[PDB]
Each structure stands twice: as C-alpha cells, then as structure tokens.
C-alpha cells in the first residue's frame, strides 16, 4: 500500500517495499527505507528494477533523535524529485512513524512549509476510499441526503 | 493500530481487533468487523472483554454493493456511541476500505455531514506522528525554520 502524498512522493508500507511487480508498475525510481536493518544490505529486487536506495537506521522510540537523519533524507528525496521521472517510495517496517517524519521534514526543508501545513498535505493525501465502487456508492448516498426528495 | 476519528469511534486494523490487551486498555465496548469471514463466529476474546460484536460480510470489490450494509452498520455504531462509555472499533481484514466506508456512511447518516466533510473528519484524525519524541523534534525544526536566527 502507498499514497502519493506529494507529486512523485509515495508514503507506503513494508509490503509495498517488498512488492517487485507493484514497484515496477508504479515506476518507482528511488526507495528511502526509514528503518533499515543494519544486518541487511540493499533489497534484492532494487538493482534490477533500477531503483536507487537509501537506508537510514532508526528505532521508533522517543529516545531516538530522528533529527540526525533529516538532512540526509531530505537531500535524497530532493535529488529523486528534482529529476523528471523521479518517483520515490518512503517507508518503514511497521507503520508510518519513521517514514512520515522524514517526509514532513523534507516538505519543511525544501518546500517552505510549516509543520502544520506539511501535516495537512500528507493527511489530505492518504486515501481512505480505494474501492471505486464504494466511492460511487457513497457519492450516491451523499446526493440523496444533500438533496432529499424530488 | 487505531485512530479515534470521531469521539469514541476508532478506525483500526485487524491486528488491533486481535489484540486483547490493547482492546482492554482502550476500553472498547463494541467491535464492527466490516469483513466478517462467514465460517467464523464471534472473535474468541470479545465475550470476556465485554465487547458487543457485529460482523458484516463484504468483499472489497467494486462489484460488491456496500450500500446493503450502510443502515445496519450505521445503526450499530449509533447504538454504541449513544451510550456514555461507548467506544467502538471498526475494522476490516486488510486495510481500511470496507471499514472507512461504513464510518463515512455513519457520519453522513447520523451527524448530517456531506461526504466531503466526513472524509475530512476521518482523514484529519488518522495520525501520522505517534512518536512523541519525533513530534517534539519536528516542532523544534519548525520553530527554527519559521523564525530564523536570533
């Protein structure tokens, strides 16, 4: 699963990072793993897919100062998005804690956004109605309720 | 994982639905499974936890008309939230497709919201900075960037 929270910038999960066919379908060109396991190297499928990787080691603990990676991560995302065709997936191993933090920092550092504006941008773009049929069904309910009879 | 997207209403995942200790900690009183497997019955731990269950059978396909469950699901959520102390978890087996749709329908049917307003309410409340330390770190970056030197 992944959401395009900023043009060319996908905030996704570990399963998406592990899905060779989907990464290919989406045309991902860069992957930023916000929770790289030190005993591992670059994910096996990336070289073939033509994906450039950056693995930052971080624990999802209030005691870990993620600030240490703000610049390097933002610089990497910037390099990826600065080139036409650049599409980057940012993810971590469990939820979106470490990944979302690096994305927000990037938006703040490269697009002049305040933290509140960055949070809004990301949250507004994390979809909750992926099923086109369900969307159609909800829009139908909406018209009925907003308009009433006749 | 779960987000309180409306007072007393948690939109969560299958793992949260399977976590007896966390369901207890949160004081959940009702669970709406938007993707109940017909061969199963009520989740094993719910009776002891004192949790009232509603399992609706639905496939996450554009060919499935989720509308068939809008009223029953909304009525259930309404019953749960109408009683002080009521706390409900709504989830499905894989992401938030079936669950989010029932939550949006409930907000539209019981709180006079348009689909756009309901989507905003839900999206605004799905957290992306669960780590309090990371939040502090981002707020520090934010002050630095907004204010500059001195």
PDB file of N, CA and C in Angstrom, chain A residues 3 11 58-67 70 96-98 100-102 104-105 108-109 113-116 118-120 122-139 141-142 145-146, chain B residues 3 11 58-67 70 96-98 100-102 104-105 108-109 113-116 118-120 122-139 141-142 145-146:
ATOM      1  N   UNK A   3       0.519   5.839  -0.739  1.00  0.00           N
ATOM      2  CA  UNK A   3      -0.234   7.027  -1.097  1.00  0.00           C
ATOM      3  C   UNK A   3       0.725   8.050  -1.675  1.00  0.00           C
ATOM      4  N   UNK A  11       4.234   7.597   0.176  1.00  0.00           N
ATOM      5  CA  UNK A  11       4.427   7.180   1.559  1.00  0.00           C
ATOM      6  C   UNK A  11       3.750   5.811   1.569  1.00  0.00           C
ATOM      7  N   UNK A  58      17.083   3.620  12.159  1.00  0.00           N
ATOM      8  CA  UNK A  58      16.377   4.364  13.187  1.00  0.00           C
ATOM      9  C   UNK A  58      15.392   3.478  13.923  1.00  0.00           C
ATOM     10  N   UNK A  59      15.256   3.726  15.215  1.00  0.00           N
ATOM     11  CA  UNK A  59      14.331   2.972  16.044  1.00  0.00           C
ATOM     12  C   UNK A  59      13.165   3.900  16.321  1.00  0.00           C
ATOM     13  N   UNK A  60      11.965   3.336  16.369  1.00  0.00           N
ATOM     14  CA  UNK A  60      10.773   4.133  16.622  1.00  0.00           C
ATOM     15  C   UNK A  60      10.581   4.293  18.123  1.00  0.00           C
ATOM     16  N   UNK A  61      11.483   5.067  18.720  1.00  0.00           N
ATOM     17  CA  UNK A  61      11.484   5.343  20.152  1.00  0.00           C
ATOM     18  C   UNK A  61      11.647   6.840  20.391  1.00  0.00           C
ATOM     19  N   UNK A  62      10.984   7.377  21.427  1.00  0.00           N
ATOM     20  CA  UNK A  62      11.091   8.810  21.736  1.00  0.00           C
ATOM     21  C   UNK A  62      12.533   9.160  22.094  1.00  0.00           C
ATOM     22  N   UNK A  63      13.317   8.129  22.417  1.00  0.00           N
ATOM     23  CA  UNK A  63      14.729   8.286  22.784  1.00  0.00           C
ATOM     24  C   UNK A  63      15.652   8.338  21.564  1.00  0.00           C
ATOM     25  N   UNK A  64      15.108   8.083  20.382  1.00  0.00           N
ATOM     26  CA  UNK A  64      15.929   8.138  19.176  1.00  0.00           C
ATOM     27  C   UNK A  64      15.733   9.512  18.553  1.00  0.00           C
ATOM     28  N   UNK A  65      16.825  10.221  18.282  1.00  0.00           N
ATOM     29  CA  UNK A  65      16.695  11.552  17.686  1.00  0.00           C
ATOM     30  C   UNK A  65      16.721  11.458  16.176  1.00  0.00           C
ATOM     31  N   UNK A  66      15.531  11.363  15.601  1.00  0.00           N
ATOM     32  CA  UNK A  66      15.346  11.258  14.156  1.00  0.00           C
ATOM     33  C   UNK A  66      15.971  12.466  13.441  1.00  0.00           C
ATOM     34  N   UNK A  67      16.165  13.569  14.171  1.00  0.00           N
ATOM     35  CA  UNK A  67      16.753  14.785  13.590  1.00  0.00           C
ATOM     36  C   UNK A  67      18.079  14.503  12.905  1.00  0.00           C
ATOM     37  N   UNK A  70      17.315  14.036   9.276  1.00  0.00           N
ATOM     38  CA  UNK A  70      16.515  14.985   8.500  1.00  0.00           C
ATOM     39  C   UNK A  70      17.185  15.482   7.222  1.00  0.00           C
ATOM     40  N   UNK A  96       3.866   4.103   9.869  1.00  0.00           N
ATOM     41  CA  UNK A  96       4.398   5.235   9.103  1.00  0.00           C
ATOM     42  C   UNK A  96       5.143   6.199  10.018  1.00  0.00           C
ATOM     43  N   UNK A  97       5.494   5.754  11.216  1.00  0.00           N
ATOM     44  CA  UNK A  97       6.162   6.673  12.133  1.00  0.00           C
ATOM     45  C   UNK A  97       7.462   7.286  11.611  1.00  0.00           C
ATOM     46  N   UNK A  98       8.465   6.449  11.351  1.00  0.00           N
ATOM     47  CA  UNK A  98       9.748   6.958  10.886  1.00  0.00           C
ATOM     48  C   UNK A  98       9.677   7.551   9.478  1.00  0.00           C
ATOM     49  N   UNK A 100       6.909   8.913   7.825  1.00  0.00           N
ATOM     50  CA  UNK A 100       6.160  10.169   7.783  1.00  0.00           C
ATOM     51  C   UNK A 100       6.996  11.322   8.315  1.00  0.00           C
ATOM     52  N   UNK A 101       7.780  11.062   9.356  1.00  0.00           N
ATOM     53  CA  UNK A 101       8.623  12.112   9.929  1.00  0.00           C
ATOM     54  C   UNK A 101       9.639  12.620   8.900  1.00  0.00           C
ATOM     55  N   UNK A 102      10.251  11.714   8.136  1.00  0.00           N
ATOM     56  CA  UNK A 102      11.218  12.169   7.145  1.00  0.00           C
ATOM     57  C   UNK A 102      10.537  12.928   6.001  1.00  0.00           C
ATOM     58  N   UNK A 104       7.730  14.742   6.260  1.00  0.00           N
ATOM     59  CA  UNK A 104       7.380  16.068   6.771  1.00  0.00           C
ATOM     60  C   UNK A 104       8.615  16.963   6.811  1.00  0.00           C
ATOM     61  N   UNK A 105       9.732  16.413   7.268  1.00  0.00           N
ATOM     62  CA  UNK A 105      10.945  17.209   7.321  1.00  0.00           C
ATOM     63  C   UNK A 105      11.348  17.685   5.925  1.00  0.00           C
ATOM     64  N   UNK A 108       9.184  20.541   4.792  1.00  0.00           N
ATOM     65  CA  UNK A 108       9.541  21.740   5.541  1.00  0.00           C
ATOM     66  C   UNK A 108      10.860  22.346   5.040  1.00  0.00           C
ATOM     67  N   UNK A 109      11.827  21.480   4.770  1.00  0.00           N
ATOM     68  CA  UNK A 109      13.144  21.904   4.317  1.00  0.00           C
ATOM     69  C   UNK A 109      13.249  22.293   2.847  1.00  0.00           C
ATOM     70  N   UNK A 113       7.271  24.793   3.837  1.00  0.00           N
ATOM     71  CA  UNK A 113       6.040  24.556   4.587  1.00  0.00           C
ATOM     72  C   UNK A 113       6.255  24.519   6.082  1.00  0.00           C
ATOM     73  N   UNK A 114       5.260  24.988   6.830  1.00  0.00           N
ATOM     74  CA  UNK A 114       5.332  24.901   8.283  1.00  0.00           C
ATOM     75  C   UNK A 114       4.943  23.449   8.587  1.00  0.00           C
ATOM     76  N   UNK A 115       5.222  22.985   9.801  1.00  0.00           N
ATOM     77  CA  UNK A 115       4.862  21.608  10.168  1.00  0.00           C
ATOM     78  C   UNK A 115       3.351  21.366  10.017  1.00  0.00           C
ATOM     79  N   UNK A 116       2.544  22.353  10.382  1.00  0.00           N
ATOM     80  CA  UNK A 116       1.096  22.210  10.262  1.00  0.00           C
ATOM     81  C   UNK A 116       0.671  22.058   8.812  1.00  0.00           C
ATOM     82  N   UNK A 118       2.562  20.961   6.378  1.00  0.00           N
ATOM     83  CA  UNK A 118       3.093  19.684   5.895  1.00  0.00           C
ATOM     84  C   UNK A 118       2.191  18.538   6.355  1.00  0.00           C
ATOM     85  N   UNK A 119       1.785  18.559   7.622  1.00  0.00           N
ATOM     86  CA  UNK A 119       0.894  17.522   8.146  1.00  0.00           C
ATOM     87  C   UNK A 119      -0.413  17.494   7.339  1.00  0.00           C
ATOM     88  N   UNK A 120      -0.954  18.669   7.032  1.00  0.00           N
ATOM     89  CA  UNK A 120      -2.190  18.736   6.267  1.00  0.00           C
ATOM     90  C   UNK A 120      -2.002  18.126   4.883  1.00  0.00           C
ATOM     91  N   UNK A 122       0.129  15.867   3.866  1.00  0.00           N
ATOM     92  CA  UNK A 122       0.240  14.415   3.937  1.00  0.00           C
ATOM     93  C   UNK A 122      -1.093  13.764   4.274  1.00  0.00           C
ATOM     94  N   UNK A 123      -1.736  14.237   5.335  1.00  0.00           N
ATOM     95  CA  UNK A 123      -3.008  13.655   5.755  1.00  0.00           C
ATOM     96  C   UNK A 123      -4.105  13.752   4.695  1.00  0.00           C
ATOM     97  N   UNK A 124      -4.147  14.868   3.977  1.00  0.00           N
ATOM     98  CA  UNK A 124      -5.155  15.060   2.932  1.00  0.00           C
ATOM     99  C   UNK A 124      -4.973  14.068   1.789  1.00  0.00           C
ATOM    100  N   UNK A 125      -3.753  13.553   1.635  1.00  0.00           N
ATOM    101  CA  UNK A 125      -3.474  12.635   0.539  1.00  0.00           C
ATOM    102  C   UNK A 125      -3.311  11.157   0.875  1.00  0.00           C
ATOM    103  N   UNK A 126      -3.682  10.768   2.088  1.00  0.00           N
ATOM    104  CA  UNK A 126      -3.624   9.355   2.454  1.00  0.00           C
ATOM    105  C   UNK A 126      -5.065   8.890   2.249  1.00  0.00           C
ATOM    106  N   UNK A 127      -5.299   8.217   1.123  1.00  0.00           N
ATOM    107  CA  UNK A 127      -6.638   7.800   0.757  1.00  0.00           C
ATOM    108  C   UNK A 127      -7.349   6.824   1.657  1.00  0.00           C
ATOM    109  N   UNK A 128      -8.667   6.989   1.762  1.00  0.00           N
ATOM    110  CA  UNK A 128      -9.467   6.082   2.570  1.00  0.00           C
ATOM    111  C   UNK A 128     -10.610   5.447   1.779  1.00  0.00           C
ATOM    112  N   UNK A 129     -10.677   5.688   0.468  1.00  0.00           N
ATOM    113  CA  UNK A 129     -11.716   5.054  -0.370  1.00  0.00           C
ATOM    114  C   UNK A 129     -11.074   4.544  -1.667  1.00  0.00           C
ATOM    115  N   UNK A 130     -10.208   3.530  -1.565  1.00  0.00           N
ATOM    116  CA  UNK A 130      -9.515   2.950  -2.725  1.00  0.00           C
ATOM    117  C   UNK A 130     -10.420   2.209  -3.702  1.00  0.00           C
ATOM    118  N   UNK A 131     -11.558   1.747  -3.194  1.00  0.00           N
ATOM    119  CA  UNK A 131     -12.513   0.993  -3.981  1.00  0.00           C
ATOM    120  C   UNK A 131     -13.395   1.977  -4.746  1.00  0.00           C
ATOM    121  N   UNK A 132     -13.230   2.025  -6.064  1.00  0.00           N
ATOM    122  CA  UNK A 132     -14.018   2.943  -6.883  1.00  0.00           C
ATOM    123  C   UNK A 132     -15.519   2.709  -6.795  1.00  0.00           C
ATOM    124  N   UNK A 133     -15.913   1.455  -6.585  1.00  0.00           N
ATOM    125  CA  UNK A 133     -17.321   1.135  -6.448  1.00  0.00           C
ATOM    126  C   UNK A 133     -17.862   1.725  -5.152  1.00  0.00           C
ATOM    127  N   UNK A 134     -17.108   1.566  -4.063  1.00  0.00           N
ATOM    128  CA  UNK A 134     -17.529   2.113  -2.769  1.00  0.00           C
ATOM    129  C   UNK A 134     -17.640   3.640  -2.881  1.00  0.00           C
ATOM    130  N   UNK A 135     -16.696   4.259  -3.581  1.00  0.00           N
ATOM    131  CA  UNK A 135     -16.732   5.710  -3.755  1.00  0.00           C
ATOM    132  C   UNK A 135     -18.031   6.112  -4.443  1.00  0.00           C
ATOM    133  N   UNK A 136     -18.370   5.406  -5.527  1.00  0.00           N
ATOM    134  CA  UNK A 136     -19.594   5.674  -6.290  1.00  0.00           C
ATOM    135  C   UNK A 136     -20.835   5.529  -5.405  1.00  0.00           C
ATOM    136  N   UNK A 137     -20.824   4.486  -4.587  1.00  0.00           N
ATOM    137  CA  UNK A 137     -21.912   4.184  -3.666  1.00  0.00           C
ATOM    138  C   UNK A 137     -22.069   5.271  -2.603  1.00  0.00           C
ATOM    139  N   UNK A 138     -20.950   5.788  -2.102  1.00  0.00           N
ATOM    140  CA  UNK A 138     -21.012   6.840  -1.089  1.00  0.00           C
ATOM    141  C   UNK A 138     -21.473   8.156  -1.717  1.00  0.00           C
ATOM    142  N   UNK A 139     -21.051   8.403  -2.950  1.00  0.00           N
ATOM    143  CA  UNK A 139     -21.443   9.630  -3.630  1.00  0.00           C
ATOM    144  C   UNK A 139     -22.933   9.593  -3.914  1.00  0.00           C
ATOM    145  N   UNK A 141     -25.143   8.012  -1.989  1.00  0.00           N
ATOM    146  CA  UNK A 141     -25.774   8.250  -0.683  1.00  0.00           C
ATOM    147  C   UNK A 141     -25.751   9.755  -0.425  1.00  0.00           C
ATOM    148  N   UNK A 142     -24.609  10.372  -0.704  1.00  0.00           N
ATOM    149  CA  UNK A 142     -24.431  11.805  -0.488  1.00  0.00           C
ATOM    150  C   UNK A 142     -25.440  12.667  -1.253  1.00  0.00           C
ATOM    151  N   UNK A 145     -28.909  12.334   0.395  1.00  0.00           N
ATOM    152  CA  UNK A 145     -29.029  13.059   1.651  1.00  0.00           C
ATOM    153  C   UNK A 145     -28.961  14.578   1.529  1.00  0.00           C
ATOM    154  N   UNK A 146     -28.134  15.073   0.619  1.00  0.00           N
ATOM    155  CA  UNK A 146     -27.996  16.516   0.459  1.00  0.00           C
ATOM    156  C   UNK A 146     -29.192  17.154  -0.220  1.00  0.00           C
TER     157      UNK A 146
ATOM    158  N   UNK B   3      -7.117   4.743  15.113  1.00  0.00           N
ATOM    159  CA  UNK B   3      -7.221   6.185  15.240  1.00  0.00           C
ATOM    160  C   UNK B   3      -8.626   6.528  15.699  1.00  0.00           C
ATOM    161  N   UNK B  11     -11.106   3.823  14.125  1.00  0.00           N
ATOM    162  CA  UNK B  11     -10.947   3.160  12.836  1.00  0.00           C
ATOM    163  C   UNK B  11      -9.597   2.465  13.008  1.00  0.00           C
ATOM    164  N   UNK B  58     -18.562  -8.749   3.595  1.00  0.00           N
ATOM    165  CA  UNK B  58     -18.372  -7.905   2.428  1.00  0.00           C
ATOM    166  C   UNK B  58     -17.019  -8.150   1.791  1.00  0.00           C
ATOM    167  N   UNK B  59     -16.988  -8.078   0.470  1.00  0.00           N
ATOM    168  CA  UNK B  59     -15.756  -8.266  -0.275  1.00  0.00           C
ATOM    169  C   UNK B  59     -15.340  -6.890  -0.754  1.00  0.00           C
ATOM    170  N   UNK B  60     -14.036  -6.644  -0.775  1.00  0.00           N
ATOM    171  CA  UNK B  60     -13.526  -5.352  -1.211  1.00  0.00           C
ATOM    172  C   UNK B  60     -13.387  -5.349  -2.726  1.00  0.00           C
ATOM    173  N   UNK B  61     -14.539  -5.356  -3.391  1.00  0.00           N
ATOM    174  CA  UNK B  61     -14.628  -5.362  -4.846  1.00  0.00           C
ATOM    175  C   UNK B  61     -15.624  -4.304  -5.309  1.00  0.00           C
ATOM    176  N   UNK B  62     -15.348  -3.653  -6.451  1.00  0.00           N
ATOM    177  CA  UNK B  62     -16.257  -2.624  -6.975  1.00  0.00           C
ATOM    178  C   UNK B  62     -17.610  -3.245  -7.310  1.00  0.00           C
ATOM    179  N   UNK B  63     -17.625  -4.575  -7.425  1.00  0.00           N
ATOM    180  CA  UNK B  63     -18.840  -5.335  -7.739  1.00  0.00           C
ATOM    181  C   UNK B  63     -19.681  -5.641  -6.497  1.00  0.00           C
ATOM    182  N   UNK B  64     -19.152  -5.339  -5.319  1.00  0.00           N
ATOM    183  CA  UNK B  64     -19.910  -5.585  -4.096  1.00  0.00           C
ATOM    184  C   UNK B  64     -20.588  -4.280  -3.709  1.00  0.00           C
ATOM    185  N   UNK B  65     -21.901  -4.312  -3.497  1.00  0.00           N
ATOM    186  CA  UNK B  65     -22.605  -3.084  -3.126  1.00  0.00           C
ATOM    187  C   UNK B  65     -22.649  -2.936  -1.621  1.00  0.00           C
ATOM    188  N   UNK B  66     -21.659  -2.224  -1.100  1.00  0.00           N
ATOM    189  CA  UNK B  66     -21.522  -1.972   0.332  1.00  0.00           C
ATOM    190  C   UNK B  66     -22.772  -1.264   0.879  1.00  0.00           C
ATOM    191  N   UNK B  67     -23.537  -0.615  -0.004  1.00  0.00           N
ATOM    192  CA  UNK B  67     -24.754   0.100   0.406  1.00  0.00           C
ATOM    193  C   UNK B  67     -25.697  -0.792   1.195  1.00  0.00           C
ATOM    194  N   UNK B  70     -24.992  -0.144   4.808  1.00  0.00           N
ATOM    195  CA  UNK B  70     -24.939   1.201   5.383  1.00  0.00           C
ATOM    196  C   UNK B  70     -25.839   1.406   6.599  1.00  0.00           C
ATOM    197  N   UNK B  96      -8.266  -0.269   5.098  1.00  0.00           N
ATOM    198  CA  UNK B  96      -9.397   0.441   5.702  1.00  0.00           C
ATOM    199  C   UNK B  96     -10.517   0.627   4.687  1.00  0.00           C
ATOM    200  N   UNK B  97     -10.479  -0.121   3.594  1.00  0.00           N
ATOM    201  CA  UNK B  97     -11.510   0.074   2.579  1.00  0.00           C
ATOM    202  C   UNK B  97     -12.948  -0.117   3.063  1.00  0.00           C
ATOM    203  N   UNK B  98     -13.284  -1.328   3.503  1.00  0.00           N
ATOM    204  CA  UNK B  98     -14.644  -1.601   3.948  1.00  0.00           C
ATOM    205  C   UNK B  98     -15.006  -0.865   5.238  1.00  0.00           C
ATOM    206  N   UNK B 100     -13.647   2.099   6.512  1.00  0.00           N
ATOM    207  CA  UNK B 100     -13.779   3.542   6.317  1.00  0.00           C
ATOM    208  C   UNK B 100     -15.102   3.886   5.653  1.00  0.00           C
ATOM    209  N   UNK B 101     -15.531   3.057   4.708  1.00  0.00           N
ATOM    210  CA  UNK B 101     -16.798   3.308   4.021  1.00  0.00           C
ATOM    211  C   UNK B 101     -17.970   3.280   5.007  1.00  0.00           C
ATOM    212  N   UNK B 102     -17.975   2.322   5.936  1.00  0.00           N
ATOM    213  CA  UNK B 102     -19.075   2.274   6.891  1.00  0.00           C
ATOM    214  C   UNK B 102     -19.026   3.457   7.864  1.00  0.00           C
ATOM    215  N   UNK B 104     -17.803   6.501   7.179  1.00  0.00           N
ATOM    216  CA  UNK B 104     -18.270   7.680   6.447  1.00  0.00           C
ATOM    217  C   UNK B 104     -19.790   7.663   6.330  1.00  0.00           C
ATOM    218  N   UNK B 105     -20.349   6.500   6.023  1.00  0.00           N
ATOM    219  CA  UNK B 105     -21.794   6.415   5.908  1.00  0.00           C
ATOM    220  C   UNK B 105     -22.470   6.778   7.231  1.00  0.00           C
ATOM    221  N   UNK B 108     -22.448  10.495   7.786  1.00  0.00           N
ATOM    222  CA  UNK B 108     -23.400  11.122   6.877  1.00  0.00           C
ATOM    223  C   UNK B 108     -24.848  10.911   7.343  1.00  0.00           C
ATOM    224  N   UNK B 109     -25.138   9.698   7.796  1.00  0.00           N
ATOM    225  CA  UNK B 109     -26.475   9.337   8.244  1.00  0.00           C
ATOM    226  C   UNK B 109     -26.864   9.816   9.638  1.00  0.00           C
ATOM    227  N   UNK B 113     -23.437  15.148   7.960  1.00  0.00           N
ATOM    228  CA  UNK B 113     -22.264  15.561   7.194  1.00  0.00           C
ATOM    229  C   UNK B 113     -22.340  15.170   5.737  1.00  0.00           C
ATOM    230  N   UNK B 114     -21.770  16.007   4.873  1.00  0.00           N
ATOM    231  CA  UNK B 114     -21.703  15.667   3.459  1.00  0.00           C
ATOM    232  C   UNK B 114     -20.523  14.691   3.367  1.00  0.00           C
ATOM    233  N   UNK B 115     -20.414  13.968   2.258  1.00  0.00           N
ATOM    234  CA  UNK B 115     -19.299  13.025   2.094  1.00  0.00           C
ATOM    235  C   UNK B 115     -17.943  13.740   2.204  1.00  0.00           C
ATOM    236  N   UNK B 116     -17.848  14.940   1.647  1.00  0.00           N
ATOM    237  CA  UNK B 116     -16.598  15.692   1.714  1.00  0.00           C
ATOM    238  C   UNK B 116     -16.240  16.049   3.146  1.00  0.00           C
ATOM    239  N   UNK B 118     -17.254  14.453   5.816  1.00  0.00           N
ATOM    240  CA  UNK B 118     -16.961  13.204   6.521  1.00  0.00           C
ATOM    241  C   UNK B 118     -15.536  12.747   6.201  1.00  0.00           C
ATOM    242  N   UNK B 119     -15.155  12.802   4.928  1.00  0.00           N
ATOM    243  CA  UNK B 119     -13.801  12.415   4.529  1.00  0.00           C
ATOM    244  C   UNK B 119     -12.768  13.285   5.262  1.00  0.00           C
ATOM    245  N   UNK B 120     -13.033  14.585   5.351  1.00  0.00           N
ATOM    246  CA  UNK B 120     -12.112  15.482   6.032  1.00  0.00           C
ATOM    247  C   UNK B 120     -11.978  15.105   7.502  1.00  0.00           C
ATOM    248  N   UNK B 122     -12.432  12.221   8.971  1.00  0.00           N
ATOM    249  CA  UNK B 122     -11.669  10.990   9.136  1.00  0.00           C
ATOM    250  C   UNK B 122     -10.192  11.199   8.838  1.00  0.00           C
ATOM    251  N   UNK B 123      -9.894  11.785   7.684  1.00  0.00           N
ATOM    252  CA  UNK B 123      -8.503  12.000   7.296  1.00  0.00           C
ATOM    253  C   UNK B 123      -7.726  12.886   8.269  1.00  0.00           C
ATOM    254  N   UNK B 124      -8.382  13.911   8.800  1.00  0.00           N
ATOM    255  CA  UNK B 124      -7.732  14.819   9.748  1.00  0.00           C
ATOM    256  C   UNK B 124      -7.358  14.103  11.041  1.00  0.00           C
ATOM    257  N   UNK B 125      -8.052  13.004  11.337  1.00  0.00           N
ATOM    258  CA  UNK B 125      -7.796  12.283  12.577  1.00  0.00           C
ATOM    259  C   UNK B 125      -7.047  10.960  12.487  1.00  0.00           C
ATOM    260  N   UNK B 126      -6.456  10.676  11.333  1.00  0.00           N
ATOM    261  CA  UNK B 126      -5.658   9.460  11.197  1.00  0.00           C
ATOM    262  C   UNK B 126      -4.230   9.966  11.399  1.00  0.00           C
ATOM    263  N   UNK B 127      -3.704   9.745  12.603  1.00  0.00           N
ATOM    264  CA  UNK B 127      -2.395  10.254  12.962  1.00  0.00           C
ATOM    265  C   UNK B 127      -1.203   9.752  12.191  1.00  0.00           C
ATOM    266  N   UNK B 128      -0.228  10.638  11.994  1.00  0.00           N
ATOM    267  CA  UNK B 128       0.992  10.257  11.299  1.00  0.00           C
ATOM    268  C   UNK B 128       2.249  10.546  12.121  1.00  0.00           C
ATOM    269  N   UNK B 129       2.094  10.983  13.372  1.00  0.00           N
ATOM    270  CA  UNK B 129       3.263  11.219  14.245  1.00  0.00           C
ATOM    271  C   UNK B 129       2.975  10.643  15.637  1.00  0.00           C
ATOM    272  N   UNK B 130       2.872   9.313  15.741  1.00  0.00           N
ATOM    273  CA  UNK B 130       2.592   8.629  17.012  1.00  0.00           C
ATOM    274  C   UNK B 130       3.708   8.723  18.046  1.00  0.00           C
ATOM    275  N   UNK B 131       4.925   8.941  17.559  1.00  0.00           N
ATOM    276  CA  UNK B 131       6.098   9.024  18.405  1.00  0.00           C
ATOM    277  C   UNK B 131       6.197  10.443  18.959  1.00  0.00           C
ATOM    278  N   UNK B 132       5.968  10.593  20.259  1.00  0.00           N
ATOM    279  CA  UNK B 132       6.026  11.914  20.882  1.00  0.00           C
ATOM    280  C   UNK B 132       7.383  12.592  20.756  1.00  0.00           C
ATOM    281  N   UNK B 133       8.446  11.792  20.726  1.00  0.00           N
ATOM    282  CA  UNK B 133       9.780  12.339  20.569  1.00  0.00           C
ATOM    283  C   UNK B 133       9.939  12.922  19.170  1.00  0.00           C
ATOM    284  N   UNK B 134       9.478  12.182  18.159  1.00  0.00           N
ATOM    285  CA  UNK B 134       9.565  12.659  16.775  1.00  0.00           C
ATOM    286  C   UNK B 134       8.755  13.956  16.639  1.00  0.00           C
ATOM    287  N   UNK B 135       7.593  14.007  17.281  1.00  0.00           N
ATOM    288  CA  UNK B 135       6.764  15.209  17.222  1.00  0.00           C
ATOM    289  C   UNK B 135       7.545  16.398  17.770  1.00  0.00           C
ATOM    290  N   UNK B 136       8.177  16.206  18.933  1.00  0.00           N
ATOM    291  CA  UNK B 136       8.972  17.256  19.580  1.00  0.00           C
ATOM    292  C   UNK B 136      10.106  17.726  18.666  1.00  0.00           C
ATOM    293  N   UNK B 137      10.750  16.761  18.025  1.00  0.00           N
ATOM    294  CA  UNK B 137      11.854  17.013  17.109  1.00  0.00           C
ATOM    295  C   UNK B 137      11.400  17.802  15.881  1.00  0.00           C
ATOM    296  N   UNK B 138      10.217  17.479  15.362  1.00  0.00           N
ATOM    297  CA  UNK B 138       9.704  18.193  14.194  1.00  0.00           C
ATOM    298  C   UNK B 138       9.274  19.608  14.582  1.00  0.00           C
ATOM    299  N   UNK B 139       8.725  19.752  15.782  1.00  0.00           N
ATOM    300  CA  UNK B 139       8.289  21.065  16.238  1.00  0.00           C
ATOM    301  C   UNK B 139       9.503  21.952  16.448  1.00  0.00           C
ATOM    302  N   UNK B 141      12.315  21.684  14.685  1.00  0.00           N
ATOM    303  CA  UNK B 141      12.754  22.036  13.327  1.00  0.00           C
ATOM    304  C   UNK B 141      11.867  23.180  12.837  1.00  0.00           C
ATOM    305  N   UNK B 142      10.568  23.046  13.073  1.00  0.00           N
ATOM    306  CA  UNK B 142       9.596  24.048  12.644  1.00  0.00           C
ATOM    307  C   UNK B 142       9.870  25.445  13.210  1.00  0.00           C
ATOM    308  N   UNK B 145      12.957  26.950  11.459  1.00  0.00           N
ATOM    309  CA  UNK B 145      12.694  27.399  10.100  1.00  0.00           C
ATOM    310  C   UNK B 145      11.744  28.586   9.985  1.00  0.00           C
ATOM    311  N   UNK B 146      10.738  28.639  10.846  1.00  0.00           N
ATOM    312  CA  UNK B 146       9.774  29.732  10.783  1.00  0.00           C
ATOM    313  C   UNK B 146      10.333  31.047  11.291  1.00  0.00           C
TER     314      UNK B 146
END
